[PDB]
Amino acid sequence: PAPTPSSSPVPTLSPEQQEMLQAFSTQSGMNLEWSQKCLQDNNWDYTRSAQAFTHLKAKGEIPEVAFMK
Numbered sequence: 001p002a003p004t005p006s007s008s009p010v011p012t013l014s015p016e017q018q019e020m021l022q023a024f025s026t027q028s029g030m031n032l033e034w035s036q037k038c039l040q041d042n043n044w045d046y047t048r049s050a051q052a053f054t055h056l057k058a059k060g061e062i063p064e065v066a067f068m069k
Contacts, residue, residue, distance in 0.1 A: 017036060027053070
């Protein structure tokens, strides 16, 4: 029993990522890397994420590198 010998941590994400990220890239034009962050703040909802992303495409700060440079 100690800080090291206690519990058993594990990854937070799963295949869910690629299950979405792919269909999320073409969601509103996002790439295959910036779309993930969108699906990470919303918890991979796929709708509420890409929905807040689209509004940010012309409001927040979406580097062109995403859509297509």
